[PDB]
Amino acid sequence: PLRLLSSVHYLTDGELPQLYDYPDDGTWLRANFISSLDGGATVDGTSGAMAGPGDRFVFNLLRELADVIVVGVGTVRIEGYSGVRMGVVQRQHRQARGQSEVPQLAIVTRSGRLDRDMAVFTRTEMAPLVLTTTAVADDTRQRLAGLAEVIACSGDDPGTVDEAVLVSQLAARGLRRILTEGGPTLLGTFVERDVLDELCLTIAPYVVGGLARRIVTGPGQVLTRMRCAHVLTDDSGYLYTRYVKT
Amino acid sequence: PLRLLSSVHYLTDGELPQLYDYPDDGTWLRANFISSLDGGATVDGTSGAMAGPGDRFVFNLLRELADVIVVGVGTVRIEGYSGVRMGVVQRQHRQARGQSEVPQLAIVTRSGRLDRDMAVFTRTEMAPLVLTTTAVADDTRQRLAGLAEVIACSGDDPGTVDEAVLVSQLAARGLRRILTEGGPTLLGTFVERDVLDELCLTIAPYVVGGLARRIVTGPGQVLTRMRCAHVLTDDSGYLYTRYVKT
């Protein structure tokens, strides 16, 4: 019943993008996260200490493939999100696939309370979207004039964000290939609301002990079955996994 | 830099034990845990909902290989630990390796506050060890007379358990091949105190959302590097991993 996995194929920068290609059409919400063996998502507030050159390479690839990168306001404040940076060949590849040179960033906030000089607004080639509620969309739009496109993502309830509506709002703007990088509250809502199509997860070969949070937080509790699409590795013992619903 | 993993070898019940063999001599502390993709260790207080036939098989194998199974009093109370059960061929294999027919159970408690009719005491072929502090060892020994061997595992401080001493106390009794199954507080102390030699981790193909705890809890924070020894899989997309310090 059990099979040993081992390295069978060295990947070229030609086949690697193929492994992480989005579907032909339709919207697709992919998450990319890293965590330790004992399930911790941070080493001192951030993920980076666990990320080596392999994970950086995968991380930048997934950004290169995406139409839009969706992130919660907390992770934007804490990981210090600036704009999305794309190098020359990355821009070239994107153009080859019919995409803009650099993917958009979309910042999720229920409150709408964002400030004008954040790096997402300042250190950026392309103005970001702000995904918020019907209730606060107009005021938010007014405060962030010239800095960001503000989009109401409410469903039945004008005072909350409906995550399926959020996804539809991106799709309607031609941004159907979606990548989210967190943080844990937002991922938690995508999981709880069952709109996550795929999770790419880097399993870093460390144990970090009990303090760290998981890659998801919140009161949500589900049991969503995924299919293992692939597992990659490198020389340092990292596992780069891709799982797809259902 | 990246390599695709895939199934290269179907394992027989002859080679599987070889993959998880303990070292020739010296003490070795192995942990076995299961968790979801998003790092959750429980689905409603227990692990079992995530465990399929493959994980049950690995779980029973690791118990078959161990000299002693070490568990915290919390997990004993909550997962409803009875005795360790071994089937006929398992008993045979154990005898072949020079081991007793059924491995001992050792229950860790700083307080020493255990009751006489727990299933570890009642539904058991072999009396368990209770690993506690110098401070409470004598009274605990008196309360549990006839039910358990009580062992003081204090180092410098008679009011605490020193986890390296705990390990030495098992070794001194010929129980050098140690398996721990938790719970999260105990694993947290083994990690924090750096006495964990190996982690076998079943990665279950589910996301569970933000509520669940990790396989480790506590205030501990470390960054302990492990080496990936192997990754197995089955038809259902589970990954059975084995990582070794350092």
Ligand SMILES: CC1=Nc2c(nc(N)[nH]c2=O)NC1
């Ligand atoms: C904030 C954040 N960072 C990372 C991430 N995923 C990977 N692989 N690596 C990362 O470093 N997503 C979340």
Ligand SMILES: CC1=Nc2c(nc(N)[nH]c2=O)NC1
């Ligand atoms: C309480 C507990 N259960 C399990 C475990 N490990 C595996 N693989 N599977 C389990 O079900 N250790 C902790």
